[PDB]
Amino acid sequence: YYVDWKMLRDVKRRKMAYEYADERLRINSLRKNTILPKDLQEVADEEIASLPRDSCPVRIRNRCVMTSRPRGVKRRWRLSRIVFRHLADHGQLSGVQRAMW
């Protein structure tokens, strides 16, 4: 199993975003330019809206890997602020130490 149902749904969102990465990249090119006439751009808006909801990368939420905490998570280690401390204080992460200056 996964840690949480929210994590379960986020994995599906990431998978479908990767599956539709190319299509959205191609459709957004027709919308983000001024050279082409607006008549085709209004239809481009329609087909980019016709895509499934979870396909956009905006719905992707960066949670923690271990505890799936939706907030307080560092991007470098993909770890929550609590699990990161729990590991660093035990010394299982290299180069990480208490700051004294």
Partner RNA sequence: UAAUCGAUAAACCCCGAUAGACCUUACCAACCCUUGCCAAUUCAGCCUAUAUACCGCCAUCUUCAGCAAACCCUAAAAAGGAACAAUAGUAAGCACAAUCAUAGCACAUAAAAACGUUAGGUCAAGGUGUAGCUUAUGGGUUGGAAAGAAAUGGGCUACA
Residue 80, classified by CB atoms within 10 Å of its CB into exposed (0-12), middle (13-18) or buried (19+), is buried
Q: Please, what is the minimum distance in Å from the beta carbon of residue 59 to other proteins?
A: 20
Query: How many CA within 13 A on the CB side of residue 38?
Result: 0
Say whether residue 68 binds RNA (CB under 7 A).
Answer: yes
Q: 35 or 58, CB closer to RNA?
A: 58
Say whether residue 101 binds other proteins (CB under 8 A).
Answer: yes
Q: Which residues in 5-64 contact other proteins (CB under 8 A)?
A: 7, 26, 29, 33, 35-37, 39-40, 43
Q: What is the DSSP letter of 51?
A: S
